RNA sequence: UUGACCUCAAAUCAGGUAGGACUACGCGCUAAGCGCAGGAAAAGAAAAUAACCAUGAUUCCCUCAGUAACGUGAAGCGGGAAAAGCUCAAAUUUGAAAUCUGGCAACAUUUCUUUUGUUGUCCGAGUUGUAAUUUCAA
RNA sequence: AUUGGAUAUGCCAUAUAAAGCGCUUUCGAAGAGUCGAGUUGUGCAGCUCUAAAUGGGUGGUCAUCUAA
């Protein structure tokens, strides 16, 4: 029972999500104008951050875009 | 929004606003049948907190009972027999005068698909809920038989329990 | 009226089969949930340790089991009980830790939509 | 081992814990919105016939008679004290604008 | 200096990132005995590095004893006002950036129902004011503080002058005294300060021209905006009474194409120093900061010093000035002029025409209403402004009751005053 | 003290239509009634229709819903 | 009987000309129909399906709970109360609440006229909180008329018992 | 002159539902009479106990205990069986009634050509409030 | 031949989404002809009166619950 549960975890081990066309262009457009380190200033922008995501949701988008 | 204002107004019942309305509405209620359909609850806040939703399947019925069992209990039962294809949800005092006590009864249509498909009121479709007022299973039925939790609230006594080894 | 106990052994058997039925359904996992250890509430019995209802929210926070995932692995949660002394907290935090030591939780299938 | 021991005893050493307050105990705390709503409705609905009698008795400095009416009306001295204090505040507020 | 100090790696790494790796005279005579655990009775001037003096040894003790939030608060720091406490809390956040000790601040005018919810989780580094801490000590069930080991008093002279004489005496009884390190700090050495030291510190302690403008509250910002526009090509430094107020004003002025620097930054001491050094280097520019942030910093050659918000310490402010001075004075606060008469300070009255005030209020209100981060900054700047006003030492001069809140919020960019508690 | 006396009306043996009295609304409240912070959602495009747009797009992709051009040309 | 002041204040409604002007401004900010809204969403949905920012709407606010929360938010610039709500308690406090919170209000004729504006059978009350910059003058002119023709008028009659 | 809403009506209009019988066990009103259910019913997640190192929905069994209380006659605790928790009302979705019954048209599906749904569209319900979120354990 | 809950796998998946837990210089609504009081009949019911907001209930100022 122990091994099959560990092996079954390995098979279903890709919890990480890919990005989509809308998400990728959203984060990329914010990145090109603000950089890849100043997420606080990214959040405070409203012209580009139309959905008004906070810096923590922008970081996940940036971190997720690489993979 | 305004349902908070409605409930604090309901607390003041001898007030000038409420006393005038109670006298006027008692007159119009007496001019109708003893049991008559209401288009909408006259106290929408009390109906709403007791379970009334403004959707198809829910029904409000106004009934008058001779003042001086509980009148509120008797209102539920008599409305239950009148609209016998409906389950009684709850009931609330609305008006009174020197002769009559007026109650409004919330009933649901168990055969209506909007009630049959709402998981929040689905529970009343089950046949165990036929005539909850007829069995003291409503709010005022439960209180009437002293059902509750505490120290304020028969086969077990008189029996002789004779065990197998004794 | 006399209550006669001729079905005392027929009740005993029926309860065993209900246990057997309950296992057959969820056989890799215990037929009963785990319980806390609590001290009875009187001067006569407060020196005993007995099974309680469920673990407190302070006990689960300290162990590491959030109140949502606690019930899903058969850990009851009593919101009413509390921890007036550190002895009860540490006695039952260790109980959850030992139970989690022996726990083999089997992975579930998780929806993985193709797009982002 | 994952098992429970039942009976016997445990270390009598005690270490008290200061538990925080439960949200259920917060009941009875007046709100800013509920205070506003109750004051509006107090004004709008008008006053009961017995509340008018009490306010006029307070107006003529008949406080002993006013408390006797309120206590007989509501049913307790505790309720009478609150009603007298509330209506006296109404009298002062009305007297400001009347 | 910092390298010579034996602070742990996390404290050392944070100190390098937070600020510099030097050690001032006040620190050099205070870190050693505080680290050893001996009682320290220092007397240092304002802005002499006192904040770090009682922080680095204290945080090191927290790491040394390995405190956890389930152990309650192990350190309490007492500050007289919110602005000084907030600066300390901001610095402490930088220092604890690498550690694992929870920190928190309890000050007057804040959310008591939420402050208590924070406390029952354990706040291993507590910054407080005497008024509110006593309330949380006597009236909050779930606040574990029996494991206290360090008590720090900041500016004890101001604490006793502001009216916390009895508040401290009550706090000492509730607070534990056995095996607890205490560190009093007050430049003044009055007899009452010595009495507090006797009742708190253990035996054998270680001893160590004016110009004003009368402007109504509603046009206060509009007058400022027009004045800054007129003097765009000069070196202007503006003092305010809240770090939240300066954040909004700098954010608002950057929005409308009036670039202004600030010492607020992001509560990062390195960024504030960088901004101040660049402003000193630049011959022209405009900077907004608070009195506390500018306290202890050498003011450069600046044409205009604008005191947009009343100062918290008029006794220190009159000696603070000793280009041209400015004072945005309200018609309800004309009594502050009488104080300068008592202090024997020369002054002149400045007048402005109502025609030249840039009436952009309708557009200014539309920006704040439309934008979200502007509205939150405006709301918080307005809240902190009032709370500082209600906490001023000069009750007879700056009466919050005599202040009109509708006009105040008009300056901040609100048609109607927001709902802030007191 | 008490004097154990008896009141003039002790049991031991008026403008019925007054004018409206403004003791509470005679003065206007300056500030909002709620101090609850403003949510970000009111300053952003609605997520209700974004949810609805996305499930309208899916039906357009799957052909369950006739597109505006196809429906308009079908009316001719 | 003798109607209380809080219930008699509804018999003195807004007059012909001002109500017609009020409803003229309201009809420029009617909400968007269910049939039209779908058409706007499928236009945007089709745009995003083939290949891919907007502006905040401007419509009159309705609903009893929604509007009462808008008055207490000091957001409503004009509140229009129907004069014939069947349980009168639903709006009996609205004039006094608007007086307390400094909002211009009026009691207009028929719920159906308010109901028509918002594509409903009946509306108990309507509130205008924000208008387009082009029509700021029109709302200001109407509010002045409501003050002059409804609040300045009557005034004493709402404190006297009716009937 | 027209229209909108409201209230009251009519129809052998469409779709439903109620009654009567059984009643060992259930729950009520007042053994009997009367009313109403199910495969169990009722009760049920504390406006509950306690005074302790505290306990922890309900029901049932043992014990408490023929004790206390005022011949009647328990209950807290303790041992066991079984264990499971939750839903609303009251806070603006307000940058969008996001909610739902029905008709019609397709499609799928069946203990089943008998069942049960899906999608699309149109009307109706609903802003005097249908969804989402929240239930104090927060 | 009818179906249970699982497992393996295929195809779809409206995720621009929805959660759990970190934190808070922000908030935190809680059920009335009811509770209660006076009096009659069998806790409940009748009738007269009729509330409150750290309030109300129930126990020994404290504890403990949070009704309608």
Distance of CA F11 to the CA centre of its chain: 51
Question: Contact C83/C57 with Cβ under 8 angstroms?
Answer: no
Q: Which of residues 24-43 of D touch G (CB under 8 A)?
A: 33, 36, 40-41, 43
CA/C1' separation B78–H46 (Å)? 33
Cross-strand pairs, B90 = B106
CA-CA distance, G122 to G115, in Å (whole number)?
4
Are the Cβ atoms of F68 and G46 closer than 8 angstroms?
Answer: yes
Could you tell me which residues come within 8 angstroms of residue D51 by beta carbon, excluding any fewer than 6 positions away? B14, D83, D87
CA-CA distance, D68 to D84, in Å (whole number)?
11
Of D74, D55, D79, nearest to D65 by C-alpha is D55
Are the Cβ atoms of B162 and C2 closer than 8 angstroms?
Answer: yes
Touch of G by B (3+ CB pairs closer than 8 Å): yes
Domain with D68 in it: 31-95
Which tokens go with B67? 């003042």
Chain C residue at shortest CA distance from D4: C37
**Domain residues of chain B, as ranges?**
2-145
Distance in Å, alpha carbon of D5 to nearest chain F alpha carbon: 50
C-alpha pair distances (Å), A31 with each of D11, D54, E371: 61, 72, 21
CA-CA distance, D70 to C37, in Å (whole number)?
54
Is nucleic acid strand H under 7 Å from C58's C-beta? no
CA-CA distance, F28 to E406, in Å (whole number)?
12
Query: Which residue blocks in E219-313 are alpha helix, DSSP H?
Result: 220-230, 243-255, 269-281, 291-294
Could you tell me which residues come within 8 angstroms of residue E366 by beta carbon, excluding any fewer than 6 positions away? none
Count the alpha carbons within 13 Å of E117 in the hemisphere toward its beta carbon: 7
What Rg, from alpha-carbon coordinates, does chain E have? 22
Three-class SS of residue B106?
A: strand
3-state secondary structure A38-49: CHHHHHHCCCCC
Are the Cβ atoms of F33 and G43 closer than 8 angstroms?
Answer: no
Residue ranges of the binding site of E for ATP:
44-51
Is nucleic acid strand H under 7 Å from D45's C-beta? no
Region of residue C64 (phi > 0: left; psi between -120 and 50: alpha; otherwise: beta): left
Of D69, G86, D41, nearest to B16 by C-alpha is D41
Of G33, G23, G30, G38, nearest to G58 by C-alpha is G30
Cross-strand pairs, B106 = B60, B90
Could you tell me whether strands E206-207 and B87-96 are parallel, antiparallel, or unpaired per DSSP bridges?
unpaired
Cross-strand pairs, E287 = E237, E261
Helix (H) / strand (E) containing B95: strand B87-96
**DSSP single-letter state for residue E140:** -
Question: Contact A20/A26 with Cβ under 8 angstroms?
Answer: no
Are the Cβ atoms of D45 and B4 closer than 8 angstroms?
Answer: no
Q: Where do we find the tokens 């208008």? A: G131
CA-CA distance, A51 to F40, in Å (whole number)?
9
Cross-strand pairs, E394 = none
**DSSP single-letter state for residue C43:** T
Hey, what's the torsion of the CAs at C48, C49, C52, C57, to 10 degrees?
120
Distance in Å, alpha carbon of A53 to nearest chain F alpha carbon: 9
* Chains sharing 3 or more CB pairs under 8 A with chain E: A, D, F
Q: Which of residues 32-91 of D touch C (CB under 8 A)?
A: none
Hey, what's the torsion of the CAs at E284, E287, E291, E294, to 10 degrees?
-60
Q: How many CB atoms lie within 10 A of CB E24?
A: 16
**DSSP single-letter state for residue E217:** G
Query: Which residue blocks in E71-190 are alpha helix, DSSP H?
Result: 82-95, 112-119, 130-139, 156-162, 165-174
Distance in Å, alpha carbon of D63 to nearest chain B alpha carbon: 22
What resolution in angstrom units was achieved for this structure? 3.8
CA-CA distance, G19 to G13, in Å (whole number)?
9
CA-CA distance, E37 to E179, in Å (whole number)?
10
Could you tell me whether strands G125-128 and G61-62 are parallel, antiparallel, or unpaired per DSSP bridges?
antiparallel
Hey, what's the torsion of the CAs at C108, C109, C113, C116, to 10 degrees?
30
Q: How many CB atoms lie within 10 A of CB E28?
A: 15
Could you tell me whether strands E211-214 and E348-350 are parallel, antiparallel, or unpaired per DSSP bridges?
parallel
Which tokens go with E341? 């008469």
Exposure letters E74-110 (e unless 16+ CB within 10 A, then b): bbbbbbbbbbbbbbbbbbbebbbeebebbbbbbbbbe
CA-CA distance, G65 to C22, in Å (whole number)?
50
CA/C1' separation D88–I51 (Å)? 17
Cross-strand pairs, E184 = E41
Is nucleic acid strand I under 7 Å from D52's C-beta? no
Is nucleic acid strand I under 7 Å from B83's C-beta? no
CA-CA distance, E299 to E26, in Å (whole number)?
21
CB within 7 A of strand H (chain B, 29-68) = 37, 39-40, 44-45, 48-49, 51-56
Q: How many CB atoms lie within 10 A of CB B117?
A: 11
Three-class SS of residue E384?
A: helix
φ, ψ dihedrals at B149, nearest 5°: -110, 125
CA-CA distance, E243 to E81, in Å (whole number)?
13
Are the Cβ atoms of F14 and D64 closer than 8 angstroms?
Answer: no
Q: Where do we find the tokens 């000790």? A: E101
Are the Cβ atoms of E372 and A52 closer than 8 angstroms?
Answer: yes
CA-CA distance, G23 to D46, in Å (whole number)?
33
Which tokens go with C88? 């009860």
CATH architecture of B2-145: 3-Layer(aba) Sandwich (3.40)
Interface probe, candidates G38, G45, G68, G105, chain F, greatest F C-beta count within 10 A = G45
CA-CA distance, B5 to B9, in Å (whole number)?
6
CB within 7 A of strand I (chain F, 7-66) = 34-37, 47, 50-51, 54-55, 57-58, 61
3-state secondary structure G49-115: HHCCCCCCCCCCEECHHHHHHHHHCCCCCEEEEECCCCCHHHCCCHHHHHHHCCCCEEEECCHHHHH
Question: Contact G91/G82 with Cβ under 8 angstroms?
Answer: yes
Q: Is E376 exposed, middle or buried (0-12, 13-18, 19+ CB in 10 A)?
A: middle
CB within 7 A of strand I (chain B, 125-164) = 139-140, 143-144, 146, 150-153
Long-range contacts of residues A17-25, Cβ cutoff 8 Å, at least 24 apart: A17/A64, A17/C116, A18/A64, A18/A67, A18/C115, A18/C116, A19/A61, A19/A64, A19/A65, A19/C116, A20/C115, A20/C116, A21/C116, A22/C116, A22/G52, A23/A61, A23/A64, A23/A65, A23/C116, A24/A65, A24/C116
What was the elucidation method? cryo-EM
- DSSP codes, B14-65: SSHHHHHHHHHHHHHHHTS-SEEEESS-SSHHHHHHHT--SSTTEEEEEEEE
CA-CA distance, E91 to B42, in Å (whole number)?
61
CA-CA distance, C70 to C54, in Å (whole number)?
10
Which tokens go with E339? 């104080």
């Amino acid at each position: 029972l122990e091994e099959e549960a560990v092996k079954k975890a390995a098979r279903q081990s890709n919890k990480m999500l890919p990005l989509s066309a809308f998400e990728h262009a959203y984060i990329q457009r914010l990145i090109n104008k603000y950089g890849t380190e100043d997420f606080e200033s990214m959040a405070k922008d409203v012209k580009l951050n139309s959905k008004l995501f906070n810096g923590s949701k922008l970081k996940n988008l940036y971190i997720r875009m690489k993979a | 929004g305004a349902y908070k204002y409605l409930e604090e107004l309901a607390k003041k019942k001898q007030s000038d606003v409420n006393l005038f309305l109670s006298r006027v509405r008692a007159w119009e209620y007496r001019q109708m049948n003893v049991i008559h359909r209401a288009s909408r609850p006259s106290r929408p806040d009390k109906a709403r907190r007791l379970g009334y939703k403004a959707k198809q399947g829910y029904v409000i019925y106004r009934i008058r009972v001779r003042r001086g069992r509980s009148a509120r209990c008797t209102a539920e039962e008599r409305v239950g027999r009148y609209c016998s294809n409906l389950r009684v949800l709850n009931s609330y005092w609305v008006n009174q005068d020197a002769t009559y006590k007026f109650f409004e009864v919330i009933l649901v249509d168990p055969s209506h698909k909007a009630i049959r498909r709402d998981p929040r009121i689905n529970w009343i479709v089950n046949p165990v809920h036929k005539h909850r007022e007829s069995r003291g299973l409503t709010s005022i039925g439960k209180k009437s038989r002293g059902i509750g939790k505490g120290h304020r609230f028969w086969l077990r006594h008189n029996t002789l329990s004779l065990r197998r080894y004794r | 009226y006399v209550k006669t106990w001729f079905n005392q052994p027929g009740r005993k058997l029926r309860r065993r089969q209900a246990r057997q039925t309950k296992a057959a359904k969820i056989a890799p996992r215990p037929v009963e949930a785990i319980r806390p250890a609590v001290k009875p509430p009187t001067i006569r019995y407060n020196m005993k340790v007995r099974a309680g209802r469920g673990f407190t929210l302070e006990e689960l926070k300290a162990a590491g089991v959030s109140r949502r995932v606690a019930s899903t692995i058969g850990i009851p949660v009593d919101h009413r009980r509390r921890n007036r002394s550190e002895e009860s907290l540490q006695r039952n935090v260790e109980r959850i830790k030992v139970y989690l030591a022996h726990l083999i939780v089997f992975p579930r299938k998780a929806g993985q939509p193709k797009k982002g | 081992a994952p098992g429970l021991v039942v009976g016997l005893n445990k270390g009598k050493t005690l270490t008290k814990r200061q538990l925080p307050e439960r949200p259920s105990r917060r009941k009875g705390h007046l709100s800013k919105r509920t205070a506003f709503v109750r004051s509006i409705v107090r004004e709008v609905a008008g006053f009961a016939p017995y509340e008018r009698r009490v306010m006029e008795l307070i107006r003529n400095s008949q406080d002993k008679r006013a408390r006797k009416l309120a206590k007989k009306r509501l049913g307790t001295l505790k309720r009478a004290k609150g009603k007298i204090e509330e209506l006296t505040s109404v009298i002062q507020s009305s007297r400001l604008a009347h | 200096k910092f390298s010579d100090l034996q602070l742990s790696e996390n404290i050392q790494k944070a100190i390098k990132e937070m600020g510099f790796e030097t050690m001032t005279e006040i620190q050099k005579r205070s870190i050693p005995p505080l680290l050893a655990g001996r009682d320290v009775l220092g007397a240092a001037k304002t802005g002499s590095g006192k904040t770090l003096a009682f922080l680095i040894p204290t945080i090191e003790m927290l790491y040394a004893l390995k405190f956890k939030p389930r152990n309650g608060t192990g350190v309490i720091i007492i500050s007289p006002t919110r602005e000084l406490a907030l600066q300390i809390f901001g610095v402490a956040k930088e220092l604890l950036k690498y550690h694992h000790q929870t920190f928190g601040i309890v000050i007057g005018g804040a959310n008591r129902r939420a402050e208590a919810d924070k406390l029952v989780k354990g706040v291993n580094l507590l910054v407080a004011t005497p008024g509110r801490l006593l309330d949380h000590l006597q009236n909050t069930k779930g606040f574990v503080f029996r494991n206290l080991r360090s008590l720090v008093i900041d500016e004890a002279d101001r604490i006793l002058e502001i009216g916390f004489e009895d508040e401290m005496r009550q706090i000492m009884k509730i607070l534990p005294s056995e095996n607890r390190q205490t560190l009093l700090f007050s430049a003044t050495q009055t007899t009452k300060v010595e009495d507090l030291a006797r009742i708190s510190l253990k035996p054998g302690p270680l001893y160590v021209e004016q110009g004003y403008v009368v402007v109504d509250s509603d046009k206060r910002f509009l007058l400022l905006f027009s004045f800054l526009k007129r003097n765009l090509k000069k070196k202007v430094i503006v003092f305010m009474s809240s770090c939240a107020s300066v954040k909004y004003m700098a954010e608002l002025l950057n929005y409308i194409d009036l670039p202004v620097l600030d010492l607020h930054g992001k509560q990062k001491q390195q960024r504030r120093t960088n901004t101040f050094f660049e402003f000193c280097n630049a011959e022209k520019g405009i900077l907004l900061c608070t009195n506390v942030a500018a306290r202890g910093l050498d003011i450069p050659a600046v044409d205009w010093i604008v005191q947009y918000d009343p100062p918290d310490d008029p006794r220190d402010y009159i000696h603070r000035v000793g280009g041209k001075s400015l004072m945005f004075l309200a018609p309800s606060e004309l009594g502050f002029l009488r104080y300068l008469k008592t202090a024997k300070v020369s002054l002149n009255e400045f007048e402005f025409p109502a025609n030249k005030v840039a009436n952009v209020q309708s557009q200014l209100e539309k920006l704040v209403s439309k934008n979200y981060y502007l509205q939150q900054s405006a709301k918080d700047g307005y809240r902190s402004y009032l709370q500082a006003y209600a906490s001023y030492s000069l009750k007879s001069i700056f009466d919050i009751n005599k202040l009109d809140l509708a006009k105040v919020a008009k300056s901040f960019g609100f048609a109607h005053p927001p709902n802030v508690n007191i | 003290e008490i004097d154990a006396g008896y009141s003039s009306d002790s049991s031991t043996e008026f403008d019925p239509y007054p004018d409206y009295d403004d003791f509470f609304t005679n003065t206007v409240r300056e500030t909002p009634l709620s101090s609850a912070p403003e949510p970000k959602r009111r300053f952003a495009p609605s997520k209700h229709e974004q949810k609805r747009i996305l499930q309208l797009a899916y039906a357009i992709r799957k052909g369950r819903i006739l597109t505006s051009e196809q429906r308009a040309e079908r009316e001719r | 009987l003798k109607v209380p002041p809080a219930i008699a204040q509804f018999q003195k409604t807004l007059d012909k000309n001002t109500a017609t002007q009020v409803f003229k401004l309201l009809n420029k900010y009617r909400p968007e129909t269910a049939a039209e809204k779908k058409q706007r969403l499928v236009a945007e949905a089709e745009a995003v399906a083939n290949g891919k920012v907007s502006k905040k709407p401007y419509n009159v606010k309705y609903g009893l709970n929604h509007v009462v929360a808008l008055i207490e938010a000091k957001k409503a610039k004009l509140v229009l109360i129907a004069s014939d709500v069947d349980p009168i308690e639903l709006v009996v406090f609205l004039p006094a609440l608007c007086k307390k919170m400094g909002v211009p209000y009026a009691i207009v004729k028929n719920k159906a006229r308010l109901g028509t504006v918002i594509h409903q059978k009946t509306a108990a009350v309507l509130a205008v909180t924000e208008v387009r910059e082009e029509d700021k003058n029109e709302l200001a002119s109407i509010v002045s008329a409501v003050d002059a023709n409804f609040s300045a008028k009557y005034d004493e009659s709402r404190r006297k018992w009716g009937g």
